[PDB]
Amino acid sequence: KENICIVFGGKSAEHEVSILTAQNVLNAIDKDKYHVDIIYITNDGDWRKQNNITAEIKSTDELHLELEISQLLKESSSGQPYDAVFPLLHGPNGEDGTIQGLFEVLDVPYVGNGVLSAASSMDKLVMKQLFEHRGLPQLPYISFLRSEYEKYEHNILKLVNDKLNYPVFVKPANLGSSVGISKCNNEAELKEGIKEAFQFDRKLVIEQGVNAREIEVAVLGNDYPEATWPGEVVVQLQIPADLDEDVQLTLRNMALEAFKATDCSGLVRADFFVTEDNQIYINETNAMPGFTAFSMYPKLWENMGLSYPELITKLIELAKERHQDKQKNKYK
Amino acid sequence: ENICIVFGGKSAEHEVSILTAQNVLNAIYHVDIIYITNDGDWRKQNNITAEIKSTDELHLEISQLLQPYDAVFPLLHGPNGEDGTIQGLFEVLDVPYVGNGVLSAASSMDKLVMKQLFEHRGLPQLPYISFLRSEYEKYEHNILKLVNDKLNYPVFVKPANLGSSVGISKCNNEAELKEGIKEAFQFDRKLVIEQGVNAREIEVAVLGNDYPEATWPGEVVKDVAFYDYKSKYKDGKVQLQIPADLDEDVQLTLRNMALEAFKATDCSGLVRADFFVTEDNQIYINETNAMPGFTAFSMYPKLWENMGLSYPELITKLIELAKERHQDKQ
Ligand SMILES: Nc1ncnc2c1ncn2[C@@H]1O[C@H](COP(=O)(O)OP(=O)(O)OP(=O)(O)O)[C@@H](O)[C@H]1O
Ligand SMILES: Nc1ncnc2c1ncn2[C@@H]1O[C@H](COP(=O)(O)OP(=O)(O)O)[C@@H](O)[C@H]1O
Ligand SMILES: [K+]
Ligand SMILES: [K+]
Ligand SMILES: [K+]
Ligand SMILES: [K+]
Ligand SMILES: [Mg+2]
Ligand SMILES: [Mg+2]
Numbered sequence: 001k002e003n004i005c006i007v008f009g010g011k012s013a014e015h016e017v018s019i020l021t022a023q024n025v026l027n028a029i030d031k032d033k034y035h036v037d038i039i040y041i042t043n044d045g046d047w048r049k050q051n052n053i054t055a056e057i058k059s060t061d062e063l064h065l066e067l068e069i070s071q072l073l074k075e076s077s078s079g080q081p082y083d084a085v086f087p088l089l090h091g092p093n094g095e096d097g098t099i100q101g102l103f104e105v106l107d108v109p110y111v112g113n114g115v116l117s118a119a120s121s122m123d124k125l126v127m128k129q130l131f132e133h134r135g136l137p138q139l140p141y142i143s144f145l146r147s148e149y150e151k152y153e154h155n156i157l158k159l160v161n162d163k164l165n166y167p168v169f170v171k172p173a174n175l176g177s178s179v180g181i182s183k184c185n186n187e188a189e190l191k192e193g194i195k196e197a198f199q200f201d202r203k204l205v206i207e208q209g210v211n212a213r214e215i216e217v218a219v220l221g222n223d224y225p226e227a228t229w230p231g232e233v234v235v236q237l238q239i240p241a242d243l244d245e246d247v248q249l250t251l252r253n254m255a256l257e258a259f260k261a262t263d264c265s266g267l268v269r270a271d272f273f274v275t276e277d278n279q280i281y282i283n284e285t286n287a288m289p290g291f292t293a294f295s296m297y298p299k300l301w302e303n304m305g306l307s308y309p310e311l312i313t314k315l316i317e318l319a320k321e322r323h324q325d326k327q328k329n330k331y332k
Numbered sequence: 333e334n335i336c337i338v339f340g341g342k343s344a345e346h347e348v349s350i351l352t353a354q355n356v357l358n359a360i361y362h363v364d365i366i367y368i369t370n371d372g373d374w375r376k377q378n379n380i381t382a383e384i385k386s387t388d389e390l391h392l393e394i395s396q397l398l399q400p401y402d403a404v405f406p407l408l409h410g411p412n413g414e415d416g417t418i419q420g421l422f423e424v425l426d427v428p429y430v431g432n433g434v435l436s437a438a439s440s441m442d443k444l445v446m447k448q449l450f451e452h453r454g455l456p457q458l459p460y461i462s463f464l465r466s467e468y469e470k471y472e473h474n475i476l477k478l479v480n481d482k483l484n485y486p487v488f489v490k491p492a493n494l495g496s497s498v499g500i501s502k503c504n505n506e507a508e509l510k511e512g513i514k515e516a517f518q519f520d521r522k523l524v525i526e527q528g529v530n531a532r533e534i535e536v537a538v539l540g541n542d543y544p545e546a547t548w549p550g551e552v553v554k555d556v557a558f559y560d561y562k563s564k565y566k567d568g569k570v571q572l573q574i575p576a577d578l579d580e581d582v583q584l585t586l587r588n589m590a591l592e593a594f595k596a597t598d599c600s601g602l603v604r605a606d607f608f609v610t611e612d613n614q615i616y617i618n619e620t621n622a623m624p625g626f627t628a629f630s631m632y633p634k635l636w637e638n639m640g641l642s643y644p645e646l647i648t649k650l651i652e653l654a655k656e657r658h659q660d661k662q
Contacts, residue, residue, distance in 0.1 A: 329521075
């Protein structure tokens with residue numbers, strides 16, 4: 001058997017769905033193939049651990065678990081070091097690169113994106129700037145800092161009025177999912193949206209609004225990633241999405257380009273806007289997308305013939321490969 | 333107030349981090365130090381009341397190693413310290429720290445991401461190419477032909493995430509380029525190859541959080557063209573000049589470029605911007621460094637001394653910026 005550790009919970013608003021995700025992942029892992037330990041991070045930051053999961057998780061209640069951090073991750077309960085650590089955290093303090101940096105300092109192998117890819121895909125501005133260098137189409141947008149807005153509010157609003165068309169969307173640069181995002185139908189709502197998002201962040205983006213369908217593509221791999229056929233979020237899903245053949249192939253190639261633009265590893269989900277006349281814009285990539293048994297990312301791969309337990313195993317094997325390829329770097 | 337100095341690191345710049353730590357300790361508070369060996373082992377020594385006489389005497393649970401400290405001051409160079417990794421550990425433990433955050437340290441260490449962000453900011457750069465080890469094995473031929481068609485010999489092959497000129501080689505033709513690529517791949521999975529330029533090498537120091545300030549530029553006056561590892565730390569044939577012999581408008585251009593490069597990676601605390609200036613007065617930016625060296629051969633402290641900010645004041649100012657940034661997070 002191989003030794004795996006699941007990390008879930010976290011100082012997050014999505015604390016409960018991370019626990020729900022852990023139940024689906026734990027119940028999908030073949031216990032005869034993997035020795036499984038779990039680490040539960042409470043809403044206060046305390047780390048708690050339970051050893052050797054051998055039965056099915058019957059309720060999300062029993063995953064609420066009620067030693068130092070380096071000791072919990074260093075050794076499996078079998079005594080050996082873990083072969084892979086699978087974090088299932090969402091939002092800030094989870095997919096922002098911090099816990100990945102902790103994994104790197106402690107030299108533990110882990111599933112998913114690394115420090116650079118997680119942090120660059122989290123920051124809305126950096127994400128768009130790397131997409132633009134790659135040549136990916138994006139909606140017109142403006143960005144500025146809180147310091148600049150305190151002094152140049154008049155000039156910033158004049159640029160928005162000229163370059164963009166209403167409605168517009170105001171988004172904080174480094175916050176959680178749908179946290180501080182406001183659709184603004186006039187300039188009065190625009191200024192109120194800027195004040196709301198600056199109350200918790202120092203950097204802002206303002207996007208041109210678009211009338212389009214939301215199409216998503218799932219990517220899996222390290223150095224030779226593969227993309228799925230696209231799906232749509234009608235939350236109800238439609239897999240595969242009803243698209244023209246040339247749009248389906250364009251989106252799969254763009255998802256591979258977005259994966260490379262942020263130097264991703266393991267997985268990513270590329271979300272697009274597709275209008276009625278087949279105009280394509282990339283919205284964002286998700287370093288740790290929804291991973292429940294009914295989420296879009298696993299269902300997109302099920303349509304490709306990859307089952308949920310096989311997807312979990314493939315991500316673990318990618319974690320081992322990325323760790324091995326890191327050791328062959330010289331550091332002396 | 334209690335400060336903790338972290339130095340060493342699992343990095344090819346290990347010895348440089350030790351030399352940087354000696355001067356920061358000798359010029360700086362209740363001071364504790366943590367020595368990370370070249371293999372990644374943490375070793376702590378409490379209370380440095382006396383003066384550090386040699387680099388040799390600095391060859392000495394992580395959560396318990398970190399009254400709690402008012403600020404932790406990392407002096408790590410290169411991977412596993414200057415690339416966002418140890419900054420993420422500080423974030424999880426909710427401990428204030430000096431310098432750049434997770435994203436800023438990571439995006440400035442990776443020279444490819446750095447160049448792409450500098451390009452979007454509008455900064456001038458030399459023509460370059462980048463590729464992964466996986467791509468070079470399946471596409472070696474057209475990659476070497478892309479160097480011939482897009483770049484111009486001589487070229488400089490570099491690992492993406494390193495410093496102190498480790499892994500860099502100047503290649504005058506395709507035969508030397510193929511050896512430089514094989515050598516650079518020993519340090520990283522990703523490379524950058526730049527068109528070479530004949531130019532003077534100028535550096536500018538930046539300091540601050542939401543309102544950074546930049547110094548006057550200085551020049552690395554040298555006889556050799558390649559400022560390699562031996563030229564940087566092994567012998568004193570190279571002389572620094574602060575400020576540099578440049579026109580007033582050229583010096584002001586370099587300050588404004590350093591501020592834009594600081595903001596291009598959303599820097600916090602400090603950064604050092606390095607430039608190339610040709611004989612016909614053309615300007616390219618080379619790189620920025622999230623934690624520049626503080627060795628006797630370094631320039632970041634000397635650049636701020638010329639501004640009237642002495643060495644002990646520079647250390648204190650960096651600690652204040654760390655406490656300010658931490659309070660804004662909480
Ligand atoms: N395109 C180029 N043209 C001419 N010289 C170059 C070029 N690229 C690199 N060099 C030489 O290599 C040296 C190091 O370059 P670079 O800044 O890329 O490496 P580094 O290790 O990041 O530097 P540092 O030690 O400051 O971190 C420079 O001082 C310069 O002399
Ligand atoms: N420019 C836009 N035009 C139309 N709808 C948008 C635009 N930007 C965001 N939205 C809507 O807002 C939702 C959240 O936007 P997104 O940037 O994905 O937030 P997050 O990254 O926090 O999930 C999306 O599902 C989308 O439907
Ligand atoms: K994102
Ligand atoms: K750098
Ligand atoms: K030539
Ligand atoms: K340099
Ligand atoms: Mg979204
Ligand atoms: Mg450097």
